[PDB]
C-alpha cells in the first residue's frame, strides 16, 4: 500500500523518515497519516539520496561498490514504523543491511527489538533518550547524538542561574519525555529546586485536554510562573494555541528541550504567546552543499521522490495542472516561476543525518578491508554480509564529519556534543526571531544576561515564599512541602538557633540586637545622682553639723554651773550616740561591699539603742526619789546595758553572715542587694520597743512632778514623739518594695527629734 523510495545498488540500506504527520486521535486505529512535512520529512529524503549519490562517486570511500537504498515512512507513529520494519524483515525471511532512523525514542525502541531479532544494526540521529544506551537490551543501536542527561543538567543549571526555585513541570507522554523529566526531577531535588506540580499529556490530544492542562497550570499562579517543558514540538504548539484561545498571553515563561529548539513551525500565528521563552538545542552548523542541490529541484524533473509533486502543491497552495499527481482541490493554478529559494529554512538537524549516513559507509569500508584485503569489490568472503561483523566494525568507527569535527562512538554507542541556548524575542515591529544567548559544554554554562533581560524587569524569580530570615523571626513549614513557609516573630526574651526555632534564655540575660543568643543584663547601682539620696546626705550633714556645734558648746562650758544636775559623761555619751546615728544615716548606702553592710548593721544596732538606753537611765535616776545601790556606778552599769545590745548584734553574725548578691525582681531589670534577713531585723526592733515601753511607763509615773529645769516636763514629750515615730516607721519597713532609704529617714528624724526635745531648754537658757 504505502509508497517507498529507492535507488539500486549492491548494498541496500533502509531508512524511516516521517514524511507525514502522525494519525490524529480519531484515526489511530485505521493508521491514516496527516499532512506532509518539509524539514522533518522531505529534506531528509533528498539528503539521503544525494549523500548516497555523492558516496557512489568517491574512489576513496568504498571503491567498486554501489550503494542503494529503501526509504519508507514512519509518520512519527509506532504502528506505522513497526509495519514498515516488518516489510524490511520480510525482505529477508536483496536483504537490508542497516537502518537509519527513526527520529523518536519510543518508535526507535519499538523498531529496535524487531531489528535485533534479525541482526540488523541501527544508527539514529535524534533519539536522545538515556535508556537506549543499555546495550544489554538495545545491543544493535548506535547514535551520533548524546543522551539527554546532559540536557537535564543544562536545564537545571539554567534554573539555578536565575534563582527560579519554584517551578511547574510538563512533559509529553512517552519514553523521551518521561525519562528526561524524571532525570530533571532528581537533579533539581538534589540541588534544592522546587516543583509545584507535575503534568503530562499526549502530543495528539484534543483541544479540551490542552485547555484543562492550561487551567491546571494557571491555577498555581502567581507563585509559580516558570514552566519546565520537556515536551515535543506539537505539545508546545498546543500550549500556545490554548493560551491564545483562553487569552492568557504573557503570564508564563517556558523552558524548551530539543523538541522545541528553533523550529519556526511551532511559533507561527502564536508568536506573541511565546515571546521570552528559552530553548536548549544541539550544536550543528548548516551544510552548504545540501542547499545548492535542494534549491534547484523542480517537480517535473524529479523522478525518484514519490512525495515531491504533492509537497510542491502543499507548500505553494496551488494545483499542478496536467501533472499525474494533480490533486485538483486548490483553486489557484501553479505558476511556472515558483522557486524553493523563497522562505527557505534548512532543517537544523541535517548534519546529524548526514553523519549517520556516513557512519554506515565507513563501517562497511572497514569491514570490507578486513575481510577482502587485496580484492577491490565484494569477494566471496563477504557474501552474504554478516550482521555481527558489521556491528563489531561499526563500534570502532572514527572519521571526520561534514562540520569538520571528529565522529567516534563510545562504549555505549553515543557521541559527544555541545548545547546552544536560544531566546525567542521581538526584534522590531511584528518581527520575531530566535537569538543565541549562551552555550553549555562539559558541565560549563556561559550565558549572556544583557540580551535576555536588558532591563530591571527580570521576571520575578518564581518563589513560594519571601525570605523571612532576619534573626527575630522563625519559619514554620505547613506540611505540604519544605518549599513554602509562614514566618512568625520570635519572642522578646527568646533567641534563635536555626531558622525554625525560638528558644528563651534564663533570667539575668537578654538577647542581642541580632538575636544570636543572650549575653547578660547590666545592673544598676548609681543611686548617688538620684535626688532622694542627695537630700538624705544634706539632712545627715546638717544633723552632724548641729551635733558638732552642740558638742563644742558643751565642751567649752564643761564647768556646768547649772548643767551639773545632768552628768557630763552622760551628755557626752548621748552626743556620741547622736553622732553615730548621723554617721550611719550618711553611710546608710555607703556601698554593697560586705564591710560597708557590716558597718551599717553594726551602727543601726548600736547607736539609737545606746543613746535611748542612756536616756532611759537618766530618766530612771530621778525616778527613785519620790534603796539606791550606787548612784555614781549606776552609769557604768548603764554602759553594760549598751554592751547587751552589742551581744544581740553578735547573735546576728551567729544567725547568718550577711553578703551582697544579685536579686532579680523582674526579667527586664536586675539589682544588687546586700543580705538582710527579715527575721533578724525584728529582734533589735523588739528590744528597743520594749525599752520604749519601759521608759514611757517610767515617764508617765513622774510626768506631773516638778523639776528644777522642767526636765520632767520635756521628758514626756520626747517619749511620746519617739513612740509615735517608731510606730509610724514600723509599717513603712514592711511597705515599699525598695526598702533602702525609708529606715534612714526614720532613724534620722527620730535622732533629730530626740536631740531637739532633749536639749532645746539648755540652748535657750545658755543664751
Amino acid at each position, epitope marked *: *500500500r504505502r*509508497v517507498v523510495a529507492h535507488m539500486p545498488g549492491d548494498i541496500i540500506i533502509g531508512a524511516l523518515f516521517s514524511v507525514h504527520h502522525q494519525p490524529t486521535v480519531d484515526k489511530v486505529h485505521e493508521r491514516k497519516c496527516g499532512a506532509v512535512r518539509e524539514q522533518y520529512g522531505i529534506q531528509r529524503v533528498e539528503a539521503m539520496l544525494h549523500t548516497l549519490e555523492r558516496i557512489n562517486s568517491d574512489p576513496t570511500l568504498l571503491p567498486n561498490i554501489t550503494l542503494g537504498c529503501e526509504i519508507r515512512d514512519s509518520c512519527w507513529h509506532s504502528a506505522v514504523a513497526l509495519e514498515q520494519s516488518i516489510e524490511f524483515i520480510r525482505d529477508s525471511l536483496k536483504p537490508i543491511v542497516g537502518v537509519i532512523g527513526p527520529g523518536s525514542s519510543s518508535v526507535a525502541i519499538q523498531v529496535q527489538n524487531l531489528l535485533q531479532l534479525f541482526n540488523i544494526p541501527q544508527i539514529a540521529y535524534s533519539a536522545t533518550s538515556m535508556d537506549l544506551s543499555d546495550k544489554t537490551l538495545f545491543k544493535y543501536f548506535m547514535r551520533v547524538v548524546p543522551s539527554d542527561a546532559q540536557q537535564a543538567r543544562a536545564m537545571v543549571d539554567i534554573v539555578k542561574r536565575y534563582n527560579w526555585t519554584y517551578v511547574s513541570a510538563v512533559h509529553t507522554e512517552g519514553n523521551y519525555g518521561e525519562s528526561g523529566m524524571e532525570a530533571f526531577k532528581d537533579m533539581s531535588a538534589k540541588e534544592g529546586i522546587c516543583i509545584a506540580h507535575s503534568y503530562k499529556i499526549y502530543s495528539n490530544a484534543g483541544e479540551q485536554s490542552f485547555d484543562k492542562l492550561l487551567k491546571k497550570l494557571t491555577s498555581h499562579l502567581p507563585k509559580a510562573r516558570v514552566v519546565a517543558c520537556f515536551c515535543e514540538g506539537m505539545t508546545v504548539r498546543g500550549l500556545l494555541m490554548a493560551m491564545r484561545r483562553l487569552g492568557l498571553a504573557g503570564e508564563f515563561l517556558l523552558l524548551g528541550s530539543d523538541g522545541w529548539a528553533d523550529r519556526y513551525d511551532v511559533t507561527d500565528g502564536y508568536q506573541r504567546e511565546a515571546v521570552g521563552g528559552i530553548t536548549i538545542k544541539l550544536q550543528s552548523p548548516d551544510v552548504k552543499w545540501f542547499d545548492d542541490y535542494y534549491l534547484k529541484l523542480r517537480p*517535473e524533473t*524529479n*523522478h525518484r521522490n*514519490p512525495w515531491f509533486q504533492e509537497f510542491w502543491q502543499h507548500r505553494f497552495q496551488c494545483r499542478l*495542472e*496536467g*501533472f*499525474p*499527481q*494533480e*490533486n*485538483s*482541490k486548490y483553486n489557484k493554478t501553479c505558476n511556472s516561476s515558483l522557486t524553493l529559494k523563497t522562505h527557505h529554512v534548512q532543517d537544523s538537524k541535517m548534519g546529524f543525518v548526514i553523519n549517520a549516513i556516513y557512519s554506515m559507509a565507513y563501517g562497511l569500508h572497514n569491514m570490507q578491508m578486513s575481510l577482502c584485503p587485496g580484492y577491490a569489490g565484494l569477494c566471496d568472503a563477504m557474501k552474504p554480509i554478516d550482521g555481527r561483523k558489521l556491528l563489531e566494525s561499526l563500534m570502532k568507527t572514527n572519521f571526520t564529519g561534514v562540520s569538520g569535527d571528529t565522529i567516534l562512538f563510545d562504549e555505549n554507542g553515543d557521541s559527544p556534543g555541545r548545547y546552544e541556548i536560544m531566546n525567542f524575542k521581538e526584534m522590531g515591529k511584528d518581527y520575531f526571531d530566535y537569538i543565541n544567548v549562551g552555550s553549555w559544554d562539559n558541565g560549563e554554562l556561559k550565558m549572556d544576561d544583557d540580551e535576555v533581560w536588558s532591563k530591571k524587569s527580570n521576571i520575578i524569580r518564581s518563589v513560594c515564599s519571601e525570605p523571612c530570615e532576619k534573626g527575630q523571626i522563625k519559619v514554620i513549614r505547613k506540611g505540604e512541602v519544605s518549599c513554602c513557609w509562614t514566618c512568625t516573630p520570635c519572642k522578646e526574651n527568646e533567641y534563635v538557633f536555626d531558622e525554625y526555632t525560638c528558644k528563651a534564655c534564663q533570667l539575668g540575660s537578654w538577647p542581642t540586637d541580632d538575636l544570636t543568643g543572650c549575653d547578660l543584663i547590666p545592673v544598676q547601682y548609681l543611686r548617688w545622682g538620684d535626688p532622694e539620696p542627695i537630700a538624705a546626705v544634706v539632712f545627715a550633714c546638717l544633723g552632724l553639723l548641729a551635733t558638732l556645734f552642740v558638742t563644742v558648746v558643751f565642751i567649752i562650758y564643761r564647768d556646768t554651773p547649772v548643767v551639773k544636775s545632768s552628768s557630763r559623761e552622760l551628755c557626752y555619751i548621748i552626743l556620741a550616740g547622736i553622732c553615730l546615728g548621723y554617721l550611719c544615716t550618711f553611710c546608710l548606702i555607703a556601698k554593697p561591699k560586705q564591710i560597708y553592710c557590716y558597718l551599717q548593721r553594726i551602727g543601726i544596732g548600736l547607736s539609737p539603742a545606746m543613746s535611748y538606753s542612756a536616756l532611759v537611765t537618766k530618766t530612771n535616776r530621778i525616778a527613785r526619789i519620790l534603796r539606791f545601790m550606787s548612784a555614781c556606778a549606776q552609769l557604768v552599769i548603764a554602759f553594760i546595758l549598751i554592751c547587751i545590745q552589742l551581744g544581740i548584734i553578735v547573735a546576728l553574725f551567729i544567725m547568718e553572715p550577711p553578703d551582697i548578691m544579685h536579686d532579680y525582681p523582674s526579667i527586664r531589670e536586675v539589682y544588687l542587694i546586700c543580705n538582710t534577713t527579715n527575721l533578724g531585723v525584728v529582734t533589735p526592733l523588739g528590744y528597743n520597743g520594749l525599752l520604749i515601753l519601759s521608759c514611757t511607763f517610767y515617764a508617765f509615773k513622774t510626768r506631773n512632778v516638778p523639776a528644777n529645769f522642767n526636765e520632767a516636763k520635756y521628758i514626756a514629750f520626747t517619749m511620746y514623739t519617739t513612740c509615735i515615730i517608731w510606730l509610724a516607721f514600723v509599717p513603712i519597713y514592711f511597705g515599699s518594695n525598695y526598702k533602702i532609704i525609708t529606715m534612714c529617714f526614720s532613724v534620722s528624724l527620730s535622732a533629730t527629734v530626740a536631740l531637739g526635745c532633749m536639749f532645746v531648754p539648755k540652748v535657750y537658757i545658755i543664751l
Partner: nanobody
Amino acid sequence: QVQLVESGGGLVQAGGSLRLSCAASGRTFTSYAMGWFRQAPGKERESVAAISSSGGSTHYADSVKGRFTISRDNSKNTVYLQMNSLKPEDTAVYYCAAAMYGSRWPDWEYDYWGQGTQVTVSS
C-alpha cells in the same frame, strides 16, 4: 510490479457504443495515473485519454473529445473507457498504461504497459 489486462473489445458496427476495462494487479494501484493509447495498422501509437491518480481531472485528445469518457474505480481497482458514436476510423489495437513521474500531459513517463485489445469498427 503491476500487471495490466484489457478487456471488453471486439467486433462492433458503426454508430454503436462500447466500454473497455483495464484491470491492474498489485495493491498500490491508487498511486498511479492511467492513460489509454490506440494504434491503427500501418500507423504509430497515439494518445487518446488519461486520468490522474485520484480521478478529479481527466484529459482527452482532440480526435476523441466529447464522444469519449474515462473513469476509474479504486475500490474495484480498475479503469473504464466509454465510447459513443463510433466511426470507421477507430479500428485499432488499444493499450493501457500507468504513470507516476510525469510532466504536463501528454508527457507522463509511463512504466507499466498492457497487452492490448483489438477493436474493429465496420460500416
